[PDB]
Amino acid sequence: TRTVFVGNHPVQRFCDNRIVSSKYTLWNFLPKNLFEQFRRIANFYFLIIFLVQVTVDTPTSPVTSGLPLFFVITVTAIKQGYEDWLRHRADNEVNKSTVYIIENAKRVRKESEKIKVGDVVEVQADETFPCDLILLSSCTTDGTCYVTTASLDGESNCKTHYAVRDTIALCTAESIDTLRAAIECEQPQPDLYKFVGRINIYSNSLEAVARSLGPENLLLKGATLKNTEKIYGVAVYTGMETKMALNYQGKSQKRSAVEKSINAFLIVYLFILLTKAAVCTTLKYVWQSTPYNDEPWYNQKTQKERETLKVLKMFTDFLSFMVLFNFIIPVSMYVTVEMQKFLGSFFISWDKDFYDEEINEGALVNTSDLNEELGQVDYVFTDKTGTLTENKLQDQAAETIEALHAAGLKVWVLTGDKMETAKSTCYACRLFQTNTELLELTTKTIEESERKEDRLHELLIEYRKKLEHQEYGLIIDGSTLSLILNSSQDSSSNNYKSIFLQICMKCTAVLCCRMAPLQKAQIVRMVKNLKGSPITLSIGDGANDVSMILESHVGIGIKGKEGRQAARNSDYSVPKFKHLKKLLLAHGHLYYVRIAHLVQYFFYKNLCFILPQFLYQFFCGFSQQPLYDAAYLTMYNICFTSLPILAYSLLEQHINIDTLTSDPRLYMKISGNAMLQLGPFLYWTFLAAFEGTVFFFGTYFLFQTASLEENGKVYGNWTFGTIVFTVLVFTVTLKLALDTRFWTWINHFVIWGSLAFYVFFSFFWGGIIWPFLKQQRMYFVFAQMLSSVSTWLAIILLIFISLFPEILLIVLKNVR
Amino acid sequence: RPDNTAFKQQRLPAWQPILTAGTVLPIFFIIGLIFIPIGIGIFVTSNNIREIEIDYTGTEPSSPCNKCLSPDVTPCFCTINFTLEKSFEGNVFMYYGLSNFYQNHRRYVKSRDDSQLNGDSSALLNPSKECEPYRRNEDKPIAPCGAIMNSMFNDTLELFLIGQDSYPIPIALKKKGIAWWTDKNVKFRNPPGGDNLEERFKGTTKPVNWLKPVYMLDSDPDNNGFINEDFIVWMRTAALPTFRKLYRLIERKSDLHPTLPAGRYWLNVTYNYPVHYFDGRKRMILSTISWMGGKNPFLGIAYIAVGSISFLLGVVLLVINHKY
Numbered sequence A: 001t002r003t004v005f006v007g008n009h010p011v012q013r014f015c016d017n018r019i020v021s022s023k024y025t026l027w028n029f030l031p032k033n034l035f036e037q038f039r040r041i042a043n044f045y046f047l048i049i050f051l052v053q054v055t056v057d058t059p060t061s062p063v064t065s066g067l068p069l070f071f072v073i074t075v076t077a078i079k080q081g082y083e084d085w086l087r088h089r090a091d092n093e094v095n096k097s098t099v100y101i102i103e104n105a106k107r108v109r110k111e112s113e114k115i116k117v118g119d120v121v122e123v124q125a126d127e128t129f130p131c132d133l134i135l136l137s138s139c140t141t142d143g144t145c146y147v148t149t150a151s152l153d154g155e156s157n158c159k160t161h162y163a164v165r166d167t168i169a170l171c172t173a174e175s176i177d178t179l180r181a182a183i184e185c186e187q188p189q190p191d192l193y194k195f196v197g198r199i200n201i202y203s204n205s206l207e208a209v210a211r212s213l214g215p216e217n218l219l220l221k222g223a224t225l226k227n228t229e230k231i232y233g234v235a236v237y238t239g240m241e242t243k244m245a246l247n248y249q250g251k252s253q254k255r256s257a258v259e260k261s262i263n264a265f266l267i268v269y270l271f272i273l274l275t276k277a278a279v280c281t282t283l284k285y286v287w288q289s290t291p292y293n294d295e296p297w298y299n300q301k302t303q304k305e306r307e308t309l310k311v312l313k314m315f316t317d318f319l320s321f322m323v324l325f326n327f328i329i330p331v332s333m334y335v336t337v338e339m340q341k342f343l344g345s346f347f348i349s350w351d352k353d354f355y356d357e358e359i360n361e362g363a364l365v366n367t368s369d370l371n372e373e374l375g376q377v378d379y380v381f382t383d384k385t386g387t388l389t390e391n392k393l394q395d396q397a398a399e400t401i402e403a404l405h406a407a408g409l410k411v412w413v414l415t416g417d418k419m420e421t422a423k424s425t426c427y428a429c430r431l432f433q434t435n436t437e438l439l440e441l442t443t444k445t446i447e448e449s450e451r452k453e454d455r456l457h458e459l460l461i462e463y464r465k466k467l468e469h470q471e472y473g474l475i476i477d478g479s480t481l482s483l484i485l486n487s488s489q490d491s492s493s494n495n496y497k498s499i500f501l502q503i504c505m506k507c508t509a510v511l512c513c514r515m516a517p518l519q520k521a522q523i524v525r526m527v528k529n530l531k532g533s534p535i536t537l538s539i540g541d542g543a544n545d546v547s548m549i550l551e552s553h554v555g556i557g558i559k560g561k562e563g564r565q566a567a568r569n570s571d572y573s574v575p576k577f578k579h580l581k582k583l584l585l586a587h588g589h590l591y592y593v594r595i596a597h598l599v600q601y602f603f604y605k606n607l608c609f610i611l612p613q614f615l616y617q618f619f620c621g622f623s624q625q626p627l628y629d630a631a632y633l634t635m636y637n638i639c640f641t642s643l644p645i646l647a648y649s650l651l652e653q654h655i656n657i658d659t660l661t662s663d664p665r666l667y668m669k670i671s672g673n674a675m676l677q678l679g680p681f682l683y684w685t686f687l688a689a690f691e692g693t694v695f696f697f698g699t700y701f702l703f704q705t706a707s708l709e710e711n712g713k714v715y716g717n718w719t720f721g722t723i724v725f726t727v728l729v730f731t732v733t734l735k736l737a738l739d740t741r742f743w744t745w746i747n748h749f750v751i752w753g754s755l756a757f758y759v760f761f762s763f764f765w766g767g768i769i770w771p772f773l774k775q776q777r778m779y780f781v782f783a784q785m786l787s788s789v790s791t792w793l794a795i796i797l798l799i800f801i802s803l804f805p806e807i808l809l810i811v812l813k814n815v816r
Numbered sequence B: 001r002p003d004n005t006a007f008k009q010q011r012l013p014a015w016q017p018i019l020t021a022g023t024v025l026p027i028f029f030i031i032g033l034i035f036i037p038i039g040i041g042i043f044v045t046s047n048n049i050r051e052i053e054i055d056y057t058g059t060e061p062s063s064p065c066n067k068c069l070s071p072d073v074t075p076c077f078c079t080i081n082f083t084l085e086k087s088f089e090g091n092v093f094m095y096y097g098l099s100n101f102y103q104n105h106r107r108y109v110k111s112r113d114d115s116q117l118n119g120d121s122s123a124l125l126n127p128s129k130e131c132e133p134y135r136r137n138e139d140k141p142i143a144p145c146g147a148i149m150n151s152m153f154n155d156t157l158e159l160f161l162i163g164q165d166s167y168p169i170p171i172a173l174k175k176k177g178i179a180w181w182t183d184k185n186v187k188f189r190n191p192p193g194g195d196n197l198e199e200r201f202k203g204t205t206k207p208v209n210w211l212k213p214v215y216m217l218d219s220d221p222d223n224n225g226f227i228n229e230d231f232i233v234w235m236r237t238a239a240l241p242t243f244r245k246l247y248r249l250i251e252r253k254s255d256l257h258p259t260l261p262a263g264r265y266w267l268n269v270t271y272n273y274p275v276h277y278f279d280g281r282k283r284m285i286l287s288t289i290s291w292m293g294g295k296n297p298f299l300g301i302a303y304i305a306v307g308s309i310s311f312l313l314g315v316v317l318l319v320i321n322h323k324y
């Protein structure tokens, strides 16, 4: 629809030559990051607390919730900042590289951004094309340059590119002398091959031959020229409109099942917080009813507080209980879950088993948010030509489908090919075993619509349920399947569809032949909806497999021979199909277990933290008095118990990674989001409720002694909360040291180093930390708590009483 | 080609504890043989600890301390005679307990000015606003501001041993050495400069309830104000509503005699502290101290119940594997 004028000799609408791949700009980084972080639940909930603390008068200082929050928002920025300062530096080199330009018979070298639409560009040997050019002429005879598309479509052949036949005569000679050319080009389309050109270069009299220039003359952006002294083009697309910049297509598939359970636990742990605060308020005013239970003459209210409206105190007392118990929601979870995904998705691209000596390329991570979705896959949607058969099967495209059937998945082969060329080769693909009864709904047997409604019925109501992995494999086509989804809204008594969803759930092998690219996204969408959420994967290599690669729960694009269209819209990309084994079975199983045990432990180690502070309210006058110091309510989540679970989630193989690919037999089947169901959830909740009652009521019975030392000196409430904190830090740390079945030299450094820091800190925070404080409330509280033989014995015991129900499982899990 | 290092390939050298019955069952026996011999040496140590308490709050019309239970003429003297069946052997520690006294109430715990008691010459004449209802009076700042320092335990306990004749032997009690050494020598200091103390505490008034200012709490310059041990011991809060604080300590005699020989004693209290109102009790507690502290059976009983359940479970757990 547009028209280009090269020589400025006539007979806006289009943009400039600048590509942006970043998300933030230095002007608007802070307002655009801080908004998208404080839009999450546990980030907004901790800001509502921090505001409530600075206005209302609350038990705890605002530092206890503004230092861990500012430290967690800052680290989650520095990450997303540098992770985006790349896109600058990644494209800064691409649109700041020098290119020569002939403005008007003047050959100047500008920068790649200063390039405007419709001007002469000269590219000598071995320089990427600054913009989507149209090769008006080349300098050598016959005007042919050899440019390989090493980056655009992954091919590595020296594709030929001819100059405009009519104007190969133009050889570098003063291109302003009445070089009027009317290039009526069409608007951009990302086809990367289809392009209709139209040259109307006016001669002295007339010349308008419609040379439909295309893939032979369109020199694409970012493709390096090879073995040509220099070329002469003109830009008809200048970035964000060129074919190279029309294939980004970034969108939000990233929503794992372990990231929508984190939200189900926050919704639970927030009702535990509204109950701990509503119980302790109802009890605060039942207790306060006795006139000597408020202002009992030793602590007497002040005139201001003794005259506040009772209806308002009942509200401020409620906020002071939400603020006191506000730690029951983990602050440092969001930064740890996403610092683990970033640093963790490197093992999927560093892996030497995802390396092809032919392509000479590895794996690829386009999104680091579905890592745990590789170990939850329930269905697999493949593509016959290209993934299972190269351009006969591929290297190991038959033994992988065994490993995908042993692991309990269901492989569906959505091919855009015929049936006999697909099925009769699927007899070799080895998804269809020899003694597999095949139930075929192909057109060559269903040449009648209503028979199919009987076919659906007779092979189901009298066949499929009146008599199965190695047993049945369904075979469909593109046509008979269309009627089952397109027009299935006529009879609601027994639909075509609701009956088709009964065999698609139990049939482990399915082969849909002659499927248009728009049905591959239907079948994934139909399967994604039935009976909960079968987590579907889709792996393909062509450009017709971009609908289902964008549709499914995770999309694995194969770096094939057709192009990088499926490999760049996908989430992870592997240069083979046989790499599906090591990806799901060894990497997906390890990625899920590492984060499903970091999620459970993050909610556990916080309920053990607050339950001894909720119980203390019964032995305080329900007066919201923090059991622990201030320097312990902040540091606990960010300092004392932060690294041991992070190092765990990065280096921890609860089944040796070599016995995981060797054995799929059950290993993948063990976790269908098992580690986060209701079963294991209220094993960690009722283990943290047991360990919280033990920490308090072992220090409660210990303090009936009148002295715990040999010189007969008594302890306070800071040597009471320190004994509960010492037992609490050592339990939740030695609870992880009981769960690691893979002790690296780092799991020794962060676990035994987090226990020795809490001991070094507590002996240091009890020295010269005076001048800037108004408390000195924990001066020698640690160093005296340890000078008593009876307190070492309690701590050693209460740690073991608390870790007993966990040792009791280990034994009952070894045995039988 | 990717860097074939140990770390990047997820094949770091690790340990991977293989848990076998030959390695997980003995656990239930290497504790049951360790927790029970400790739970018996503690239970035996917490039994040989001779202690005796006396509740002298009144509240019983037959108690000798019922005459000053009532708001009456203030210097009441009530005497309660107890009796030790077995003599007290080592050095003995006299406490005082209080019940229904929430020294851990939030409005109470925060009601001190630690920079004042630490000897800030700036904070001495302008105490904090946390210690609020007791921060000032008559346009003058309270010397030890606060509710913690206002309500200080102020009745005097004395012991008298009745000898072979009818006359009482006065048992000598010691005041020094009852506060943590740290928060008597470091955390609690006097105001900065001055030969006598009454001048340092110049522009300040005694707390509302005290009868004598801080600089009149004693005679020797080592116990006078902000240093007084009975004051330092009262400040360190309770952690529970029912607590007790060290009052005096009785030094063992260099002879071969017991510290507190058996007989009939006298505890003649100068009852001052009114706890009749908030329904609290007041006790005196004499006790002997061992390496583990005072008399508390929880440690012995808990070590046994855990050392005797791990040995039972190891037996049921050894019944299964060894027979199967």
Ligand SMILES: *[C@@H]1O[C@H](CO)[C@@H](O)[C@H](O)[C@H]1NC(C)=O
Pocket: B150, B151, B152, B154, B209, B210, B211, B212, B272, B273, B274
């Ligand atoms: C002792 O202190 C109590 C509580 O502060 C007070 O009621 C009483 O009058 C005092 N008696 C004295 C100072 O003799």
Ligand SMILES: *[C@@H]1O[C@H](CO)[C@@H](O)[C@H](O)[C@H]1NC(C)=O
Pocket: B077, B079, B160, B266, B267, B268
């Ligand atoms: C000790 O108690 C007895 C009881 O009569 C009596 O001597 C007096 O109350 C106390 N001692 C003093 C102060 O003399």
Ligand code: ALF
Pocket: A383, A384, A385, A386, A387, A414, A415, A416, A417, A540, A541, A542, A544, A545
């Ligand atoms: F094998 Al296809 F589209 F059916 F790549």
Ligand SMILES: [Mg+2]
Pocket: A383, A384, A385, A386, A387, A540, A541, A542
């Ligand atoms: Mg293909």
